[PDB]
Amino acid sequence: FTKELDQWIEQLNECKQLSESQVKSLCEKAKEILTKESNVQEVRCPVTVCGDVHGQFHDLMELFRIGGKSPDTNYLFMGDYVDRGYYSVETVTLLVALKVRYRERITILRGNHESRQITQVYGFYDECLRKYGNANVWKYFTDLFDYLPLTALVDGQIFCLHGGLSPSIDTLDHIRALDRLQEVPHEGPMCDLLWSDPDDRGGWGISPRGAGYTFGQDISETFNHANGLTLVSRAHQLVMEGYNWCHDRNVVTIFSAPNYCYRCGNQAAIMELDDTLKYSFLQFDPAPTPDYFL
Amino acid sequence: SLYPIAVLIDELRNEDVQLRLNSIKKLSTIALALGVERLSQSLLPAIVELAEDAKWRVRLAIIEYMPLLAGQLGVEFFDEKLNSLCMAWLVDHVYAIREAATSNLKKLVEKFGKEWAHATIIPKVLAMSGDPNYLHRMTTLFCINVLSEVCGQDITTKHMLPTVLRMAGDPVANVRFNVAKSLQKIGPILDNSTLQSEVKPILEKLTQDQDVDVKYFAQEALTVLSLA
Amino acid sequence: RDFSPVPWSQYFESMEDVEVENETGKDTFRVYKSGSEGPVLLLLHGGGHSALSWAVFTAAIISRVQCRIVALDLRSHGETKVKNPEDLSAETMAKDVGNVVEAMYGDLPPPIMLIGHAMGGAIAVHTASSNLVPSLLGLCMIDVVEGTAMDALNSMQNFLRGRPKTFKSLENAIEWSVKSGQIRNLESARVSMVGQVKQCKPYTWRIELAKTEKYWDGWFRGLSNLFLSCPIPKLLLLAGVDRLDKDLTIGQMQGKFQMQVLPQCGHAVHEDAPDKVAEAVATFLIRHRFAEPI
Numbered sequence: 121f122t123k124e125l126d127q128w129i130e131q132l133n134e135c136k137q138l139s140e141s142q143v144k145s146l147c148e149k150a151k152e153i154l155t156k157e158s159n160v161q162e163v164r165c166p167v168t169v170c171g172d173v174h175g176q177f178h179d180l181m182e183l184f185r186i187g188g189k190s191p192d193t194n195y196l197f198m199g200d201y202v203d204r205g206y207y208s209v210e211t212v213t214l215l216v217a218l219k220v221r222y223r224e225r226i227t228i229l230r231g232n233h234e235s236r237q238i239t240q241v242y243g244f245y246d247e248c249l250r251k252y253g254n255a256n257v258w259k260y261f262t263d264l265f266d267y268l269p270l271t272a273l274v275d276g277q278i279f280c281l282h283g284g285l286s287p288s289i290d291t292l293d294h295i296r297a298l299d300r301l302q303e304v305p306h307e308g309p310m311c312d313l314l315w316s317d318p319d320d321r322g323g324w325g326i327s328p329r330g331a332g333y334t335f336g337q338d339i340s341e342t343f344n345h346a347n348g349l350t351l352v353s354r355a356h357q358l359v360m361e362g363y364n365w366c367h368d369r370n371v372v373t374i375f376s377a378p379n380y381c382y383r384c385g386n387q388a389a390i391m392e393l394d395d396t397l398k399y400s401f402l403q404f405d406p407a408p409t410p411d412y413f414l
Numbered sequence: 415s416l417y418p419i420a421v422l423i424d425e426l427r428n429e430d431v432q433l434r435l436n437s438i439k440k441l442s443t444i445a446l447a448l449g450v451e452r453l454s455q456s457l458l459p460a461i462v463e464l465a466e467d468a469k470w471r472v473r474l475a476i477i478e479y480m481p482l483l484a485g486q487l488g489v490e491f492f493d494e495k496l497n498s499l500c501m502a503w504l505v506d507h508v509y510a511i512r513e514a515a516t517s518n519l520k521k522l523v524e525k526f527g528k529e530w531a532h533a534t535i536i537p538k539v540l541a542m543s544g545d546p547n548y549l550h551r552m553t554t555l556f557c558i559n560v561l562s563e564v565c566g567q568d569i570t571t572k573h574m575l576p577t578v579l580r581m582a583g584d585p586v587a588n589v590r591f592n593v594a595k596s597l598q599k600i601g602p603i604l605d606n607s608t609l610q611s612e613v614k615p616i617l618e619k620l621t622q623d624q625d626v627d628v629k630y631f632a633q634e635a636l637t638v639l640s641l642a
Numbered sequence: 643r644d645f646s647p648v649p650w651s652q653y654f655e656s657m658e659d660v661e662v663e664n665e666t667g668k669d670t671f672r673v674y675k676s677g678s679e680g681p682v683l684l685l686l687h688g689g690g691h692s693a694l695s696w697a698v699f700t701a702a703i704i705s706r707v708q709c710r711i712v713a714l715d716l717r718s719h720g721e722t723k724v725k726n727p728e729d730l731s732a733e734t735m736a737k738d739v740g741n742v743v744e745a746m747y748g749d750l751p752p753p754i755m756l757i758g759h760a761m762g763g764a765i766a767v768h769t770a771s772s773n774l775v776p777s778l779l780g781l782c783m784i785d786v787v788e789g790t791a792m793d794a795l796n797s798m799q800n801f802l803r804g805r806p807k808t809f810k811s812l813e814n815a816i817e818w819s820v821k822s823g824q825i826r827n828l829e830s831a832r833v834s835m836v837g838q839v840k841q842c843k844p845y846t847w848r849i850e851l852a853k854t855e856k857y858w859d860g861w862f863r864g865l866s867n868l869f870l871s872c873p874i875p876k877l878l879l880l881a882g883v884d885r886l887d888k889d890l891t892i893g894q895m896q897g898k899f900q901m902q903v904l905p906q907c908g909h910a911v912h913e914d915a916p917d918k919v920a921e922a923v924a925t926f927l928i929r930h931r932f933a934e935p936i
Binding site for chain 2: 166185187188191192193222223224394
Binding site: 204241242243317326327328329330356357358380381383384386409410411412413414 | 688689690760761785786787790791794797798801802823851858862875876881882883884885886887888891892895896897898899900901902903905908909929930
């Protein structure tokens with residue numbers, strides 16, 4: 121089975137999907153591994169933190185050319201593995217295959233995209249349909265997304281998650297207490313961690329995004345100090361540079377999808393944390409129906 | 415035939431990445447045009463800066479061109495300008511550069527000889543073994559993987575193997591399983607006396623590692639080396 | 643069963659022919675009203691349509707939140723008699739919206755949410771941006787995005803001068819709208835299509851919309867950046883992610899507004915899925931506490 125996995129990886133590296141049957145097995149074992157994982161998954165450095173990838177398979181290959189190959193380089197992904205229906209299948213299937221092959225070598229968190237809600241509507245479900253004929257593969261991945269850990273903690277100091285902070289969570293134990301094994305709710309603590317944004321007006325604000333909360337620097341500083349944290353690292357927001365500091369370096373945003381949706385022109389970035397938790401940022405470029413609105 | 419250098423240069427420093435990259439894969443023919451003193455100052459300076467161009471693909475285009483260039487300059491003018499360029503790529507921020515730079519040393523040893531390598535190259539490669547960053551510590555092991563192929567039995571055993579075997583006790587698991595992956599690769603290039611009393615005991619220890627991966631690759635190495 | 647019409651009085655509680663004065667003379671507008679309390683939802687239809695496009699929506703939304711509905715027949719559309727029906731610039735039509743508000747209330751403008759479809763989407767924005775509604779608390783744009791609308795100009799020029807010129811009867815107009823795919827909801831077609839056509843002579847188009855081509859650039863140009871600059875809670879509803887252009891994609895990934903996709907709809911999404919459009923606007927309203935649920 122270890123060598124079947126190597127075969128699947130080799131294949132996905134050539135952008136060639138696995139069979140419906142194979143996806144099913146992959147997801148079965150992935151559930152089994154991720155069950156043992158915590159809502160606040162303990163990660164030990166050196167790791168490379170990665171933000172949104174958005175089903176952009178080729179730019180993920182680019183990511184690996186920058187940071188290095190798995191399992192040699194340890195990676196921590198902060199969600200949004202799927203987006204539009206072009207190469208989202210290969211992108212997610214690869215990252216899952218890596219996790220199944222190498223439990224200790226990568227961590228894959230849940231993003232707001234890893235949900236039945238968004239996947240049905242953005243493209244992933246359509247891709248599964250065009251590439252498999254049925255949509256069982258959409259079901260095998262969305263059932264799996266329920267098992268992704270929500271947050272991660274690098275050496276008890278650097279806190280990682282897709283979105284941001286919640287008015288319903290003060291401590292890491294609050295996150296640990298949650299039942300994460302479900303479809304992302306529209307309301308409450310779990311939603312917020314996947315949907316919230318850092319913000320330039322102190323305190324809490326109603327999220328213009330539809331779900332979650334905008335949160336200010338005063339909240340970041342409070343949250344970090346109470347949990348003994350030095351940094352909150354998160355994704356979720358497109359940043360033209362790939363990465364961005366805000367809230368006086370209490371928060372960093374890491375967006376890992378270059379030229380998002382093939383039109384934005386943004387850079388991507390990953391954050392390398394060395395053997396002693398020294399940060400360095402690496403920026404990269406991309407790799408080289410009614411028609412009536414009146 | 416003395417003016418197209420101005421044209422070639424203009425494009426090598428242009429804004430658009432596309433002109434830069436393709437005109438680079440054009441330097442070989444222009445070197446053979448008339449390049450004894452011309453490459454020295456009329457063209458090498460432009461190559462030197464392109465070695466640290468911010469666009470990693472352009473650094474790749476130089477790295478891959480290096481062996482053909484280092485050829486036409488010769489051994490005696492390599493330790494001069496280009497040795498530092500070659501070494502500094504090993505420690506580049508982009509893995510694909512470090513990786514290309516690794517396989518670049520091999521092509522260099524292919525031209526200049528295993529003796530030249532034992533003097534110039536191998537020590538600077540042994541340095542990265544103590545590097546605080548594990549991404550670099552592993553580059554050492556990737557170089558030893560590449561160098562073992564063209565250095566032969568005696569030189570690999572003497573000046574490379576001890577460094578590999580000493581890395582079996584690295585605090586980072588990613589380094590430890592690259593040790594087991596290295597011995598699998600280099601093992602065939604070692605007499606049977608070295609594999610049994612020097613190598614095998616170390617691989618035996620690694621199978622008892624705390625990490626899932628280090629175990630697996632220590633086992634597979636023993637299998638592939640008929641040791642089992 | 644039937645393709646026979648359904649009167650507006652099945653969905654709206656009342657109507658009014660609102661009087662408005664300017665430079666050359668006086669104009670009468672026509673609004674269809676429903677509800678007695680809560681915020682007013684000011685509704686602006688697409689090109690060549692009428693307030694009647696919102697008929698079903700209104701019924702669905704009123705039974706969800708305590709709101710009021712003001713569905714406005716824009717100039718040259720529906721039963722709006724204007725001294726100058728040839729001038730259909732973005733500015734003039736937005737000026738009109740503002741004036742209807744003043745003429746109806748002026749002294750007492752109640753909380754207002756703007757909701758615009760297609761053309762009415764661009765006008766809603768131009769109205770919001772110029773701050774012509776002094777109580778406006780929210781803005782909704784339905785199925786219009788600048789980049790794609792600009793890309794569609796020629797093709798919707800083609801559609802129009804492909805349309806049938808006349809209709810044997812109002813029934814045939816209703817039938818044609820479903821059969822052609824203009825409206826995917828027969829209930830909505832039966833009530834809205836009477837605001838699309840008039841009669842004397844067979845039935846013909848209420849507005850020779852092909853004439854308005856000269857004003858189309860002024861409608862959609864800079865609409866994304868304009869929409870993004872209105873510092874109020876915004877909603878954007880699309881039939882698909884394909885509608886997005888560069889500027890709104892960057893905008894939405896930066897969490898600046900809310901987007902729902904309803905891929906089960908054609909272009910007239912409020913006509914095709916009035917149920918779910920009501921639901922989205924309802925949630926929006928309750929969440930920002932602009933309205934109260936039933």
